[model samples]
Target chain A: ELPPLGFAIAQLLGIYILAQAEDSLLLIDMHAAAERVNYEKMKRQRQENGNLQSQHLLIPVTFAASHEECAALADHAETLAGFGLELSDMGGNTLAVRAAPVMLGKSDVVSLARDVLGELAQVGASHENRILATMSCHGSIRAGRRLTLPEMNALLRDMENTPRSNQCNHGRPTWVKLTLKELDTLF
Target chain B: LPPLGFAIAQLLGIYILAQAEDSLLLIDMHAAAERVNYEKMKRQRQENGNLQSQHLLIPVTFAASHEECAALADHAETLAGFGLELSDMGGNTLAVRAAPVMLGKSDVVSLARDVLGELAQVGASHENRILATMSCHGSIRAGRRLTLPEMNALLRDMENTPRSNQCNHGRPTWVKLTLKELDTLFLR
Candidate 1:
């Protein structure tokens, strides 16, 4: 059994999920989206504590690869740093890494970094480098983790502040839109 | 009776097609994309390396993160192998330095957004990259009317495509027609 990474598949599969669960959404879901709302309020009991505590990793991830790959990593160091990662070149096709953002999985950073470099070398998705770094550091949410309302709200607010959060890491719209007229059709 | 339901949906789609004169079009957008993408990849593979690219008239700036930047570094050439010149523009942005000749529109920005989304899925190893583009291009709009000519064209494309069994998004593309059913629906 595999986990839902909450990026590509989630973006596309939401339709099936929506179809299976409930075909209808309230006017509020529509209104919040339409008004470009900077805020959201979920069920009162589910709020998170809005804590931004940074989680520091015990070990830095080390990467070994070509000079080109190293350059790719070097190019993104600042963006990575923004997310609390510090990367230094250990020399000769190697990077001495220490610490990924506290929020990301320490056990997974090496593998994640390897994949990121691979994408850079292969797909040329370097344009979205920051997002690559962000998603890697942030990691996808797990099922049943129960986002506190504050956490959800904070995410929504960050979404509003962040351009393109309308779509998550993958280009799936974080929100699907239905016009009031379309809503009527379902009723 | 679910068969009957398909018939009615077909009738309604036809009715809408007739009503919209020329601005609306239905397409086997999925298959059209699939074929084009298949061809593009094949050609790129033939080149054995990134078939050099044409620079964009004006580069589009997207806000992404470093890992994404490296992801571009990783997949950039592979995408070029698909006739897309996704390149590092430094930071979290890729410039539409080049693209496939098959894709319409001069706006690399829109192309960038659309292709980037498709790549996100394809990068995960989806075989039908062309299908991904068509699906991304042809998602259902909340409120847009189609013109008759456009509707007819979309129908023609679907009818001709190898995989018109579904729309670009993988929902079934057709509804079977039966004269007997038509007579029944007309019955009291």
Candidate 2:
């Protein structure tokens, strides 16, 4: 159902390591992607008293825009800034961006602003504004080349560390896994 | 780019899979994070602590290979022009009078050795090796526990630096796996 990198990943999707010798490869997906996220959980467990960590970019990144973009940016800029986006216009519609955010490094500035403004323009900051903004901003993991074990494990730990990162940004499972025995004909 | 690169590559591969290409999640997180960390360290070095020039009281003698010594002896003043004041002692040893302050209490002897090594790698680019040595030593440690903000800064810095897809060692930086693809493994 896919091509080179794509086809290969599809086949391995939710793949399980039935067993492994030295040279054998392992398999996992959204399920194991939670490894990092889980490590973070353990980190938090160790640190019974702490808050989130946030960092700001040394220089801001401003994107070019127009009237619509400016307004959209304005509406959500502050809210999103809380997520660590300090934005401003360099000139006509050019946006000044930042990394210092209220949330993790996950917000998509342009998309979030567009969605917020689009929704605001239509529904005027409906009750689901936050959800709309997040949905608009979240980035997802699709599929690709095979990952090295350490890299995969690191990613999993990262995911596990993240709050509610069990799912991809859009609330989809970041990974899935299956036992090879589940595919046994005898079963 | 460290984190997003992973996401982007994952999305691209998935996009390819959905369009009927291949399947697999290849993530190079080390390179991905390395690029992020490198850039972050550079920025910090530039912003927070660019080396301050300090004249050493005891001029350390540098033991250079015949060629390196010849090169250093030849370009001693030129190198010193870049703050590597060297005095010809006698045989292969050159007195290191002053070094860059970029390295605070960092072993000057080791730094001198590193600069010599860098001179070889950078094809003896004048001051290039010295700069590389400084940059090399300024980078973050791999085992260091990164604070969230530090990680975030690393990612942001990486997003801007091009080709962060690979680390200094020329390895792919990140890999990704998608939910839809993972489901495929469950097929009987």
Candidate 3:
């Protein structure tokens, strides 16, 4: 439970940079770790409470979208609503966002909503598993956001408690560890 | 730097004995060979806080108070039996002109003071301390260098010596560290 907290970010953008462990260095993907943590929360919530909870928007934030994207959202609204996003039809290729998952309060919902609709339009898969996975992906910290030492530790604590923490919902590895001996060989 | 591993310089002539139980051991040639000699020279062996004598390169001079000076004059021959050769230098000071060669690497002045301190306690421990000091000082000073073959011969001598874990003086003669320990040290 007491991993040494001496990590410094190594790079940003494509993969989140994090490295620190005695005798071994851990390279972690920021997005993947975030997804893993979020997915675990969603999983435990559903298991314990029968379904996840939602938060209603105090004032609905409207956003414009192309007709095709709006249609995709309409088509997948029931599937997305199963994961705690409530949507409604609005005139002229715009969508009404009545509510969202409470876990995603800090997220850019207007932008994320557009991205989610585009993702469903391309994949055309709205099964509960895929929706939940996508919900996790959207709720997590996006790439390029600067994370402080405290923020990274907060994420590390969440991941440590998470089962299957090494893998994201998409099954990609969240991190890999390289030993000092292995590093010595490269030089 | 962590000692990743150690290798014998190979030509330093002395006995080398090796054994494996759990930990790994590398011993100083002098300590190991001296222990072998220490055991053979004594009927029974004990080591720890007794006495040993060493000859002074330059005689060790001591300035004594009147009581200590009179004490030395009183016990000259008894101290002599322990291989300590002392002589008066005109006043209360005495010079330790010679000590047993076996006690080669000890502080003669301090050792002499300790021996004198015990003389006041006297009797059985008195006689025992003197003999232990004599036997220890008289044993092998494995300061001699050896060839590979010579070390083997000394190893044979060790097998013949009983209870060889410590020299008669009770100092451990060998120690070992494991490969796993090295790994942990280097963080492999």
Candidate 4:
């Protein structure tokens, strides 16, 4: 039973959209709101299919690795596969990244693999949600890009339908409402 | 000499980054634009005695409360001075016949209601408050993207406009970030 955030009036500071509700102003953090929407969609897809969809790289990314990185890859191969990362040890301190989460297909696979390995090596395989969060962060809309009124309204509609769209993955508020009465006091 | 390497803080579209002789200046584009517009409007009113008004081919009519209607009836002349022509129609309705020329295509109904509310609250001393509100509505808003040339034009206007440092509501339009301060940030 949440208040409906009305249509977007303008895009604010390239990072937020200003929407006009019935009696309030809705300032929405575009990146944060989009991240939450993407995160929830990803979680749903994972639940339905049992694992996230992985996209195989036409050309695998290979990089030199440390022993701990190699061990981390070997130890959490199955767990990593569940998150849509397919890593192979190419022998002699080399690692090949064959696939990555479809959502993060555009990201730098080598860096993504290294970060995942670094996390897995430090915290073990219990950080699956954190890994998903990272992927969603990379996949969602970024700040600074310009959006058309139609695109902005689309985002507002999606946020309305999505669960927990009020906050980002890190629990920061994605939108703030300022009433007409509250704004009158500032004058 | 002027500042060099002026650019938008691309990520936050509201800010402009410029390299001065020894400092980096961060300008709030919306605030700067608001001040520029406010000062220009004040100057125009001082010189011309009133803001220019444009009549709408078809007046915008909306439902109004008793207080709003009374506000219009009591201050019709004062509201006209501000380039807003409002009429109290029968049955708690209000019609906007003309609006300030500068507000071009904005939501006139909302602006009329806000101005009426202000007039009802402070009958006589609503000049500056109404002017500030009008300027805010007419000026560049935070989220609207500006090209580099548009931003540069605003900077040029700020350079020439009086009281360009602060906006209509007394908020700083720009701040200086000295190279020394940046160095300290990096532990240089």
Candidate 5:
């Protein structure tokens, strides 16, 4: 049985959640853990359903784009469509986003679109995994956002259930466990 | 001008990062606050001649080590001067009848034991040690969140207070990272 990591005692610097386990302290990198959780879940859904579900925005998001960003969008149109993003070029360096991945509910679609386009411009659209990683990164919680105790605990539970939850998409550690002995030595 | 430029953020809930003119400063919020409180209490004691003691309604009784009992016997008057009144209850037991007024809501028994331990170890000129214990119990603790204004206030206090660079325990309360040093860290 997994050792119970108790409820979050406090948020550390708005970036980490400090939690207590049976005989250890758990410092969870909130952003990295959330990123990994979202990334793993997206991967699982794709494996099971063959394609990620997409949701059309109630009102499409339109933003002025750089020439390179507009070019990236045009070049990767089919690839972005496969990742559940529907984009169209409006006249004069403007891009309109009609739909996004189902996982990105309530997230900032404009920012996500900009980030995805930037990545596709830097590294071509051939890397599907990279595109998915970008999507999950945007969908995950950002730093400096305060989370309630229940929300923090829910994230902890999800981390325990998700595969590869130890590291984020960028391979950064998601959490560190300090045992009571180690703490005693430090004090 | 003060070395501290502006409050940036609280790191790990225990340290505060501030931007200086040409550097960054990392301050241990708890340790820095503890030293500030300790020095202030010492100054107050010097002015008033003695710290006011508060008598506990029901005295705290605890089993004491032989060394602890001996320290209590030797330093009872000294402890009383610092606002801690101890009574030897016979057979390795002691009662704490009073403590400093500033140590409100503190664990008196633990404080007493720690003070006695310090007395036993140092034996003389240990007044600062006892005051350190009192300040430690009274100061802000780690994991307690502080707002930006509160953190900036601490930085200001540290700038104004003497010996604020080190805590009561002689640990450095803050460190400065020059822009050049930070750039070196990133191999710039």
Candidate 6:
């Protein structure tokens, strides 16, 4: 919950300062809250669209793998495609990765490919959600970074708009609210 | 608040269900812990007199919406009685000069915000609900893993707390289900 310009972006010790009138104010954390919103938005968009957008790499990256990993990758090829990744069975211990999820643009295609094969070898299935989660986490701004008043205000607006903004992807609470009565008891 | 003949086996971090005497108890750790903390907090307030307070090196100022402002103004006197000294700086700004010692060097600014949010929910003020809100905020939440000792500690605290059957928010903290019913559900 936010009050219009009712707060200032006090120095961030992870939590923020919301100045209220007459001896009442709020201590809140905006970092994880923003991340929470971003993740939910990504998830909701993916759900509605039924697939994440894929970007074709200009130069296909190749990574060396073991025969067992290659075999496992072949089995998991379709599963990866479900998340908008296209892999090719290049001869020998190398794979030609043509495309990946647009959201994972910052991710290294070679490492991502190796990780996907490792996931397949271990779980016998593609962890598409984990990949998407990593993308969203990477997309999130670091909590330690500072925010301007306008930016902080925008985050509050975002918090008000999102229903599941309370917890981050890992289920940690983004913020905690206190009461006036509770404050009094403290004194 | 007393349930007996009980111990625990914590699994997957969250769930801690067990049979105590007769029926099985499935607990929401967050709610139970909150209830226990609330019990301790109420006792602390009642038992403590002229409790020590800390003065902020620089007065922590908070800005709030108009509604929060009004709520703070209405509850200002009540706050003073609790040992918090606050000045209602005009223009929706609050100056926090001191906080209670029991708070234990916690961030007053964050604490103030949480308190304001809790206060904003009240149509009319009462004692229990306010305290309940405090416990709700202060208590440990779900998604946290507790050691066996920690689980038993919470269980013991809950056993001793008055009205520990439910949390301060009036939600049942533990659900008791019979073995016969559980077995029937599994088609045993």
**What TM-scores does chain A show, candidate by candidate in order?**
0.38, 0.49, 0.72, 0.67, 0.80, 0.54
CA-only RMSD, every prediction: 29.2, 19.9, 18.1, 10.7, 7.0, 16.8
lDDT, candidate 1, A1-187, per-residue tens: 2111111111011111111112321111211221222212111111342321234555666767678768867676654454345666889888755655444435366655555555555433234434433333334232233334344343444444544445333333445433334433422
Docking class of 1: incorrect
Query: For model 2, what fraction of the real interface contacts is kept?
Result: 0.06
Q: What does candidate 5's lDDT look like per residue over A20-136, in tens digits?
A: 676666768788788888788777877787666778988888999899989998888876776778888987999889998887644678888888888788763347567677778
Q: Could you give candidate 6's per-residue lDDT for residues B64-157 as a string of tens digits?
A: 6777677677787666544466677798898887765544434566666666666777763355565565565432454465566767767887
Indicate the residue-level lDDT of A178 in model 2.
Answer: 28
Alpha-carbon DockQ of candidate 6? 0.01
Model 6 chain A: worst 10 consecutive residues (lDDT sum)? A17-26
lDDT of all the models against the reference? 0.41, 0.44, 0.59, 0.73, 0.75, 0.60
> Which candidate ranks first by lDDT, i.e. highest?
5
The prediction achieving the highest TM-score against the true structure is 5
Model 1, residue B57: displacement in angstroms?
3.9
Runs with alpha carbons beyond 4 Å of true place in candidate 5: A1-25, A29-31, A65-81, A87-95, A114-126, A143-155, A169-171, B1-41, B53-101, B105-188
How far residue B147's Cα lies from its native spot in candidate 2, in Å, is: 36
What is candidate 4's lDDT per residue for B1-188, written digit by digit as tens? 45433543322445565555665565767777777777777877778878777898899999999999999989888787778998877999999999888766467887788888888887355567777777766636645666767667777888888887787767777776565554343220
Could you give candidate 4's per-residue lDDT for residues A95-116 as a string of tens digits? 9999988755345677778877
Fnat values, one per model, are 0.00, 0.06, 0.00, 0.00, 0.00, 0.00
Candidates 2 and 6 compared by TM-score, better number: 6
lDDT of each residue in B79-110, candidate 3, tens digit only: 76565777777678878877754455356666
Select the stronger candidate by lDDT from 1 and 6.
6
| Second chain alone, TM-score for each candidate | 0.55, 0.45, 0.49, 0.79, 0.70, 0.61
lDDT of 2 by residue, A28-145 (tens): 3433344334334433532553322335556665556668767766666654443334556667667765553233333454554445445544434233434333332333222343
Report candidate 3's fraction of native contacts.
0.00
DockQ of 2: 0.04
Q: Model 3: which docking level applies?
A: incorrect
Q: Which stretches of candidate 2 lie over 4 Å from their true place?
A: A1-54, A100-151, A159-174, A180-187, B1-188
From the highest TM-score down, the ranking of the candidates is 5, 4, 3, 6, 1, 2
Interface root-mean-square deviation, each candidate: 17.1, 13.4, 18.3, 11.4, 8.4, 18.7
Q: Which ten residues in a row have the lowest lDDT in candidate 1 chain A?
A: A11-20
